[PDB]
Amino acid sequence: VMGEIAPLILKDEDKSELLSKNLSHLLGNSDAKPAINGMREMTEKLVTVLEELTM
DNA sequence: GTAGATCATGGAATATATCTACGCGTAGAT
Numbered sequence: 001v002m003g004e005i006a007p008l009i010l011k012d013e014d015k016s017e018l019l020s021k022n023l024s025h026l027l028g029n030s031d032a033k034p035a036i037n038g039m040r041e042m043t044e045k046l047v048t049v050l051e052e053l054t055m
Numbered sequence: 056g057t058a059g060a061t062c063a064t065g066g067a068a069t070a071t072a073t074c075t076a077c078g079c080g081t082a083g084a085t
Contacts, residue, residue, distance in 0.1 A: 024082055032081090 001026070008049040 006026050007015045023029065028042055036043050 022083070029082065030080085 004053060005046065005049050008052065009045055 001023060002018045002021060006018045007013075010018060010026050018025075024032070027036070031040070031042075036046075
């Protein structure tokens with residue numbers, strides 16, 4: 001996640017400095033929950049980034 | 056001689072989306 005999805009999701013940060021963090025900084029584990037499979041904004045951007053990465 | 060018993064004597068207005076306070080589960084740091 002922080003290797004590839006984070007730089008495309010987190011727009012303005014140092015990617016190497018992003019490589020040494022916790023998943024919640026970009027996923028938002030305060031919410032998290034199986035609700036990521038729903039229609040939430042982070043789900044939207046994650047799906048967009050995944051679809052762009054693998055075309 | 057008298058008192059009691061006997062006999063005579065008689066026409067025609069409801070449900071729902073929204074605002075707000077609180078505990079709190081988890082995230083972050085080390």
